[PDB]
Each structure stands twice: as C-alpha cells, then as structure tokens.
C-alpha cells in the first residue's frame with residue numbers, strides 16, 4: 001500500500017512526493033485531482049495528472065462537461081483514474097487567485113468522505129493560491145476517511161509537518 005507517509009492524525013497521512021509518481025507506483029483506488037469547474041487540466045496538479053494520462057483525462061473530462069455542464073466550486077465528480085488509479089475524484093477547491101470564497105474549502109474536502117481511502121493533494125494549495133497550512137488544517141478537521149496527502153514541494157512539506165498542531 002502507501003509507504004513513507006508521516007502519520008498526522010488517526011486518518012490523515014502526509015508525504016513529500018509528486019502525486020503523479022505516487023499514483024503510478026501505488027495505483028490507489030482513488031486519486032484526487034485539484035480540478036477547476038470546467039475540468040480544464042492545464043497546470044498544477046491537474047495538468048500534471050492529465051499529462052501522465054497522455055491527455056486521456058482531458059478527453060474524458062470534456063465529454064463529461066459537454067454532457068453535465070461545469071462542476072460547482074466545492075463540488076466534485078468521479079471519473080476514470082486511467083493509468084494512475086481506479087478512479088479520479090476531481091475536486092474543485094476555491095481558487096483565491098480567481099477571487100473565490102476560501103470558506104468553500106471545507107465543502108471541497110467533504111467530498112473526500114465519500115471514499116474510504118484516497119491519495120490527494122492539499123486542496124486550493126499551489127496555483128490555487130490558498131495557504132497550504134490552512135488547507136491541511138481544514139483537511140484534518142473535515143476528512144474522516146483515510147487520506148494520504150502528497151506534497152510536491154520539500155520545503156513546504158517540512159513547513160507543514162513542523163507547524164502542524
């Protein structure tokens with residue numbers, strides 16, 4: 001299963017790892033994507049996960065959007081995990097750089113509770129503009145299922161572990 005994770009709480013674990021490499025090695029049941037409402041996987045975790053699927057994630061996502069319309073900020077959808085996982089849970093955290101409500105981060109993490117175990121990034125962190133320390137706090141206070149967080153940046157990983165209350 002997952003290896004080298006530091007245990008933060010009863011159910012939250014964390015590792016300094018590229019979620020793409022973690023997904024390829026583990027092939028978890030669920031990999032979480034840091035999605036936007038349009039499922040346009042252009043950069044950040046989304047661009048990296050999509051590029052690992054050879055764009056199959058984007059092709060599937062465009063068909064999903066053509067049929068269903070955009071997701072809500074704080075919402076999610078379950079699609080294929082392609083070569084990375086059985087499923088990909090596309091979760092839309094608020095993007096602070098697009099002036100979205102940071103209060104929606106708790107709603108976004110609530111989506112994780114529908115899956116017993118997940119490999120995930122910190123929602124709204126990175127190019128989404130939120131404070132990753134705040135995202136980790138909302139994660140451990142909202143997610144009750146088993147979440148294995150992959151933090152790409154080593155310096156940030158150390159900052160998150162060393163400041164975790």
Ligand SMILES: NC(=O)c1cnn(CCO)c1
Nearest residue numbers: 018019020044045048152
């Ligand atoms: N895991 C990440 O946050 C991330 C962002 N870009 N990339 C490119 C290499 O996979 C990885």
